[PDB]
Each structure stands twice: as structure tokens, then as C-alpha cells.
Symmetry: C3
Subunit: 396 residues, 3 copies
């Protein structure tokens, strides 16, 4: 009969055809069913995966465990949960790539319209150039410099640390004081040792330096004064010409100098070897100056200006008979000279009668004396006898 396929009219074929030679088409192939090719496949321009109610995907099979094959199969799936009526409906459009175990990564647009690219592990780029914000929850390490156009802010008590060689140096704000601190040697990332180089009180701003301070090029305290425990060495500049040296703006002020070299101290006043004499009548001793002897001593200056300046010279003894004598002088700005050193009068260096214009108590000579009431010589009193217009004698 005509149970054969017509070659020129539209035919429905109810046999299962097996084409053993190349099949050539020049018109659309339209199937309601599946396709399977045991060889490779190619199409022009576009491949569309149609969706009739279940999300579309591509599957990349792992194949046998040999050659260049993967350990697991992979897929690309385009899906969402906006329409699923679940507890999460915010994953509107998701492009997900992953294997049998879990996703590797996905991009998604959420219901709010914003895009996220999630990586289920470590992102390893060469460079990073982000136009927006960065947040990193874990520890960060940088191999070179880090430059910000803004401020670096730490919320950690130990905030900024510089490590080099054996030591970490760090700034610590402990909420009460901010400290500059140091580690033990070889403990560069660890805690502070016992040193307290510098701290600032967070409330008052007062600074404490705890391990000593050296300053070069001068100090000025503008206000509030100075308290020192427990000595001050103000060390004057010792020059060969101290005896005659005019003060300058650099050398005014308080200082002391140990003048211990004879080339200098021979120019200054000496001490006097003292000679003890004894009053013939009372037996009380008194001192008189013997020879002047040059001596080392301390030169101390006081006063703050080229007008207001004076010095003290205190000899110090370096031999058994040596004694200390003090001398003073004043800078005379208008005369452009030091006053001459004058000796301080003290119990070790008293003034003599001849220094003051007083009669010696012993062996004295004078031009004239007037006695009002009586002169006694040994046991005779000589008194005025105005009646006989003379003097009366009077044994006692």
C-alpha cells in the first residue's frame, strides 16, 4: 500500500527512523522533546535555556577520574526566591556557580536592586581597586606602605606600634592616660615592660617623663615655676679670664664655677692666715689678719640682667693651715666694670680696729683723749677737782 513516506508533501512518520548518514537541514528543527548528542555541538550567535517553571542551568560533568578531569561536576544556575513564599524572598535574581559540595561563588541582585558578588572562600586578585567602602572583619597584613588621605583611628588600648630590631615601641591610650611604651627585648609584639618614658594625662594634658630627660639648646619655663628634688648643679662656663670677664646676655644668671687652677685663682683674692692675740686685761682672744695666701675657690654669680648681677668668691682650703674667706663684688654696667672684690667680715675673718677707726684695746697710741669723770692708773684715781681748779688724787 501507501504506508511509505511521501517525499513532497507534509508527512507524519510513526516509525522510529535511524539515520545512518549525515542529515542536512535547511529549515527549523522544532521538538517538544529532548536532544542528546554523543559528539560535540555548535550553534550560531545565541543559545537560550528556556524556563517553563523551574530555574535553568548548565551542567559540566566530571567524567572519569582521569586525565584533566575535575573531582566533582559543576553547574551554573540562575534562580531566585522572590516568588517562593518562603521566609526569605529577598534573593531576586541569582547567578550561582558551584559543585556537588557547595557553591563556589554567586552574583545576585536583591529585592532592593543592589548587587552582591559572594565568594565562598579566598579571593586572590593581583590588584584591588574599590570605588566604595571596605570592611574586613579579620586580621589584616600589608607588605609595603599604607597611605590614607584621611585619619588612622584605633579603638585598641595599644593603638600604634613601631617594631624594629629587639624592640616594640607603642602608643597606649588606657582611657586614663596615654603612654609611650616599650617592650622587653625580643618581645616586640607583647606587653609593656616597667619603663615609663612618657605619659599624658587624658583629663589635664599634664605630661610625666619617667626615665630621665636630657635637653639641648635651652629650656624656658613660661609660667608656674620649677620644683627640684633634690639639687641643682648650675655649671658656669669656665674661661681663663673670669677675673676680668664682662658679663654678656649668654652668661648673666645664676651659676657656680670651681676655680681650681692656680693660673686663674692667683688672680682672685686669697684667704688670710689668722693670728690670735689676747687681751692683756681680760684674757679674751681676738683675731688679726696674717699673710694673704692665694687659694682655689668657688665663684658664684647671681642676677638675671646686664644691670643686675653680682658675684661671691668663696675660697676653699687645700692645706692644713688654710681657711675659708669670702669676697663679694657687683657688676657696674654704667662703668663697664666689676667693683673690686671686698672681704666679707665674719667670725673667722673679723674686721680689725684699724679697718674701722677704733682704738686698739691693748698697747694703743693716740693723739688726744678727753675723760669726763675719772682716770684710774693702778690704784690711784685721778678726778677733776674744780674747786682748787685742778685734779685730785685718790688711792683705792
Amino acid at each position: 500500500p501507501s504506508q511509505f513516506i511521501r517525499r513532497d508533501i507534509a508527512q507524519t512518520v510513526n516509525g522510529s527512523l535511524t539515520l545512518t548518514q549525515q542529515t542536512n537541514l535547511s529549515a527549523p528543527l522544532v521538538s517538544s522533546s529532548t536532544g542528546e548528542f554523543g559528539g560535540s555541538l555548535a550553534a550560531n550567535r545565541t543559545f537560550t535555556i528556556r524556563n517553563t517553571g523551574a530555574p535553568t542551568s548548565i551542567v559540566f560533568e566530571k567524567g572519569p577520574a582521569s586525565g584533566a578531569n575535575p573531582a566533582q561536576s559543576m553547574s551554573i544556575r540562575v534562580w531566585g526566591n522572590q516568588f517562593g513564599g518562603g521566609s526569605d524572598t529577598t534573593r531576586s535574581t541569582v547567578f550561582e556557580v558551584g559543585d556537588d559540595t557547595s557553591h563556589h561563588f554567586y552574583s545576585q541582585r536583591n529585592k532592593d536592586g543592589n548587587i552582591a558578588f559572594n565568594i565562598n572562600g579566598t579571593v586572590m586578585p593581583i590588584n584591588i581597586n574599590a570605588s566604595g567602602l571596605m570592611n574586613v572583619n579579620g586580621t589584616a597584613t600589608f607588605g609595603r606602605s599604607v597611605t590614607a588621605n584621611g585619619e588612622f583611628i584605633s579603638k585598641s588600648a595599644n593603638a600604634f606600634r613601631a617594631i624594629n630590631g629587639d624592640y616594640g615601641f607603642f602608643i597606649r591610650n588606657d582611657a586614663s592616660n596615654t603612654y609611650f611604651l616599650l617592650t622587653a627585648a625580643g618581645d616586640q609584639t607583647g606587653g609593656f615592660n616597667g619603663l615609663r618614658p612618657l605619659l599624658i594625662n587624658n583629663q589635664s594634658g599634664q605630661i610625666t617623663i619617667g626615665e630621665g630627660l636630657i635637653i639641648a639648646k635651652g629650656v624656658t619655663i613660661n609660667s608656674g615655676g620649677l620644683t627640684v628634688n633634690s639639687r641643682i648643679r648650675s655649671q658656669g662656663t669656665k674661661t681663663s679670664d673670669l677675673y676680668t670677664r664682662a658679663p654678656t646676655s649668654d652668661t648673666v644668671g645664676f651659676w657656680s664655677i670651681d676655680i681650681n687652677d692656680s693660673a686663674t685663682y692667683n688672680q682672685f683674692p686669697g684667704y688670710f692666715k689668722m693670728v690670735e692675740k689676747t687681751n692683756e686685761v681680760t684674757g679674751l682672744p681676738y683675731l688679726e689678719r696674717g699673710e694673704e695666701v692665694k687659694s682655689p675657690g668657688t665663684l658664684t654669680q647671681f642676677g638675671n640682667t646686664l644691670d643686675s648681677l653680682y658675684q661671691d668668691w668663696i675660697t676653699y682650703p687645700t692645706t692644713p693651715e688654710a681657711r675659708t674667706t669670702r669676697w663679694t663684688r657687683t657688676w657696674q654696667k654704667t662703668k663697664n666694670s666689676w667693683s673690686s672684690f671686698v672681704q666679707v667680715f665674719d667670725g673667722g675673718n673679723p674686721p680689725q680696729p684699724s679697718d674701722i677707726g677704733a682704738l686698739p684695746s691693748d698697747n694703743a697710741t693716740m693723739g688726744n683723749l678727753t675723760i669726763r669723770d675719772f682716770l684710774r692708773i693702778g690704784n690711784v684715781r685721778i678726778v677733776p677737782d674744780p674747786v682748787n681748779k685742778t685734779v685730785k688724787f685718790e688711792w683705792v
Copy 2:
């Protein structure tokens, strides 16, 4: 006749075939036209999308708005603009993935040969490990420590800030000076308050400390001296043995000590009671030294070396009739002793005639006296009379 398909030779079919049963092929299928499968599709090893003049793509349809379907369709497109003759021809090879609204991401090889991976939103990895450079234009926040092998550099005036509790501490380089500054309490991320703990002049390096300074373990000024407004309390170390204590390298220098305890000051010189006498002839007063009375006082030392050192002792009055007296001594290194304190002579503590070997102004006694010109007793003048080897007595009215 030949309006039927042959099973044995090549055959052109000119009617539309509908195959209702499975079709098997064992040789290539070559179409110059489209393919449409209402079911799923599979191929072996490689799928190739061919390009005859327009970029190639895969389209993932969104389907009905139900189940696990996406809200928008997506595509993968491979394209470029190197050959399009536009103002931009630098996007040489682009792999772009996105939806109906915009791309989600793309990778691109630029015309310069370098690769970029652009993400149109937020990237959310677990770890990051970059072998090259990082740039971030916006604010950065880190949850733990940040370690660099290089330098941290800020171009912001407020450059480095440590926040803890109520306060921010920060370093500010304002182009003229660099300051160490503090915020008001509870204003930790804000501006500086009025405090000026420390600043450094950027030109000279000179430091100003603005809120006071405490120092432990010594200060040395190497050069330039010291100016102080407006007093210096150099507080010496007070010990029970100050009267006899040899100086040490630690105690040389200038200081003062208030010796206010009698166990110590009773070892030191006292002040002297003074009696005011009157010269009978002239009526002018003079002070006669009385009893020494022990007293608290100030001990002040000067000198900087174990050779060059001396002290002043200035008593101060604590009772209604007490006076003040000053005393001095000097350290004697070669004797290993202080000289004995000696009294300073001054208008309140004058030298006494017996101290100096001067005759008292009245009621006096002496061994002998020589008069050259005259001695007068009452109205009698006694004068030399050498021609008679005697003296004359002249009443002189």
C-alpha cells in the same frame, strides 16, 4: 514514482516531516537553520557558540514568577569594542554576566593586555589575598589588628588617633606645628579641646609642653641654659646627720632645707640675744651680744663639686623675742670635714669690741696707753713738757 523517499541513496525531502517516534542518528547533523528543544539538551565535551558578525551569548530565561525562578532573565555575553570605531576602543575582550537591568559583573582584557574583573556592587569573600596593589576610595574599617611591613602615612591634618574610654588622643600636623592633642570627654572622634599637652615646631623642631611637666630620674640641660618664671624650689634631702654629713656626688649642688626639728637644729648655731646699750657721750645705741639660743633655720648649699661646695645657715624666729643670725661654712675635701660655722657680721649681729681687739667706748680697762698731744680730765689738760723731761697740768676753763 519518485514522490517517495529512498532508503538507499541521497534524497532531498521537500515536505515537512513530523517524527512522532524517537529519532536515532549515527552521523553528523548539519543545519543552516535553528534548533528548538521543548525538553532538556545534552552534548559531549564541547559546546561552541559560533560568531558570524555579532557577539555570542547564552540566555537564561526567568520563566513564570513562581517557585525558585529569578525575577529577571540573565545572560553571559562575550563582546568587545576594539573594532567598533567609537571614542572607546579599549575594551578588547569582555565576558559579561548580567540581567535585564545592568551587568552584575564582567571580566575584561583591556587593549593594553591587562585584565580587570569588575563587580557592579559589593564583593563578599571570606579571605582576601592580593599579590599586587590595593586602592580603596571610601572609608575603611578593620575588625582586628593591621600590620604593615612598610610605613603608615596620613595626608590628613589629624593623622593618628587612639580612642579608649572617654577620650581620643591624636597627632595633628597642621603644616606649621605637630601637636599631641586630646578630645573632650565623650567626644572621642571629634576636635581638639583647649589642652595643649605637647607640640613640635615643624621648622625649628622646638618643643612646647603646655599643661605642666613632671620628670622622674633627673634632668640635664646640655646647652642653652635655663630661664624660669617665676621661682625655683630646690628642695634638699633632709637627714638627721646634716650637721656632720659629708657631701656625695648625689648631694652636691644648690638646694635649701628647712631645718625645723629641734633634734637637728640644736646641733646647729643659734641666734644671739642682743642687748641695746646707749653710748653715754653721743647717745647712739649699739648692740651687745648676749646668750646664744638654738633655733630652726634654713640650710642652703652652693657649689657643684666635692671640692667646691659651701653652706649658709640662716636662723628664723619662732618666738616673740627671737632674732635672726646667719652663719657660713665651707666643705674641706683635703680634711674630709666642713669648716666650723662662723657668724656673719651684719647690722643685726655686729662684731663686739672683744671679738676684734678694740677698746670699749666707756667704762674701759686696758694695760697701757700712749698719748702724743694731750689728755684732758675734767677741765685739766695734761700735755708733754719734754724740756723739763716731764708733763704739764693746765687748767683750761
Copy 3:
């Protein structure tokens, strides 16, 4: 016999069919060979690339070099090296996207089960939000602030640098000392100049300030004392009432003041004019006190407390014949007053006979005198004579 195809029975076609009209299928198409479509292709729900020994891939052809075509073809390949491929066996499953030259990016799960997403160039997101760690090997730049909840640590000698205007300020830990340093003007990223504002010794914590120090609001040295090279100007607060001013807790201590204005110095003691006289008998000179002359001077105070406090007043000459005199007084807390200034006795300002109750050396008057041994008038000794109960004269 029947070299024609049955339209209702399973057939094996052995010549090449060329179909010129639309082919419809309603059952599976199953091929052991390849497919090639010159138009677009579509399938429902899933596309699977089967793997029978070689890794699966999709190839996107580059086409002619015109329009919107890419310069190179691209592929997505899913492969691994766990089962072959040289010396590395750790790349278990790799999803690789790239062109003819190299990969652009890949995701992979390694043998240990961990996922990496590798980008062969620059990643350019808007925001970054990493839940784990960050490492960046190259230089890093931030456009705004950088906040860390932890510590910032630098291993670079030059550790923290703040740049503004012409200068960089930086903290440098050089292993031995930590320095606060400054650049030359206009060399903001460069080395330190010669300035040494501040350094901390890493071992002792001792601080050195190298370019001068100003302090406001007071200084206290708690221990260790003070050494100064080479002067100290302790400048007291000059007020109009210095003569009578009671000390306060703020004004106790050591200082000097130049009292240069007569309104104030006229209240203080002057110097005394002196005339040099000569003792006629001995030829020895002595200074005789004359008028007080008001003078500017230096007031210096010593002592640290409201009990322990005293002052020196040292006049200085401002006219050609002016002398210098020193005066002293002590603060008397219990009397709430300064003692009266008293004159210092020195070689330029000796005591006078009237100060001490001594007889002047000549031209003198007194009430009475007792002579134990002899009175000599001219060359006659007047001595006591017991035998007549008067005096005898003896020529010498």
C-alpha cells in the same frame, strides 16, 4: 525490493537526507555524533555537557574583527589535576574562564576542600565586605579614614608619618632609639633632616629633646635633681609692693629681681657714701660712713617654704661715684613680717666704732678709763707709786 522508507515501522535510512522544510519532533532525538546549527539554538531547563574522558567546555567564538566582536575567543572550562596533569595534584575542581592568551579568572576547590577565586589582574568592586582575613602584598592607598578595632603595627623603621603642607612628621624606631622626626620643607615623603626634636632610648626609656624646650604651667622634678649648662635665670615676679609683700605659696623659692625704678628702690636701703680717712699715728686708712644714697639693686630670695625664707638686697651703682652695699632680711612667719633689712659688713662697708660700742681711734671723749700698767704722755710714763699714794713720772 523496498528501497523506500516505511511511514509506520522502525526503519534504517542509509542515504543522506536533506530536509528543506521545518522538521517537527515529538519524541527524543538521540545521536552518537555531532550537531551543527547555523542559526540560534534553544532547549528547555537544562543543558548538560557530558564528559567521557576530557574536560567539558563552552567556547565563545570571536568572529570577524568588526562591530562589537571581541579581539579573542573565550571559553569556560571545568577541569582539574587531581587525576593527572603534571606535578601538581591539588587543583581538584576548577571552573576557568579565559581567552586565547590566558585565564581571566577561575574558581576552584582544592584537594583539602577549600575554595579560591583567582582573578588574573585587578578586581574592581564598589564595596568590599570580607568576613575573614586580608593580605595585600603591594602598596596600599585609602581615600578616606581607616579605622581598626585592633592595633596598627609597622615593621618599618619609619613607622608612622603625618604629612601636611611643607612637612612630614614621623616616628622612627631605628632599633636603638625611637625618634620623632621632621623632613626638609617640600620633601614630605623623604628622610629626616638634621633636627632632633625628641628621642626615646629603647633600652633605658631616657628621653632627649634636641632643639629646645618651652614649658607652661610649671615643672616638677620628682627625683634625680637637675644639671644646667650654663646658667639659670630665675626671674621673680616684680610688683610695686616688694618691700612689704608677704610671701605666698606661689612666691616662695629662689629668684632674683632687678629693682631698677626709683618708686620701688627708694623704699629699699641705699648704699652709704664713704670717705677714706688715715689714722695719724699709724698711717693706716679706714672708711668713714656718710649719707645713705638710694640706689637700684638686685633683690634675691632663697628658701622654699612660708617658714624658711630670706632675702638679700644688693645695690648697684648707676652714677660715677656710687658704691655698692648688701643688706639682708629673714621672713618671720610667726610675726607675719620681714625682719628689718640690716647691712652686711664687708671691706667696702665696714662697721663704725658707733655700731659696736668701741672708742674711736682719736679725738675721743669718754666717761672713765682704767689703766693697769702705765699711761705715757709724750716720753713720760705715769705709773703708780705706792710709797706716796700717788703717781710717779718716769722719763723715757
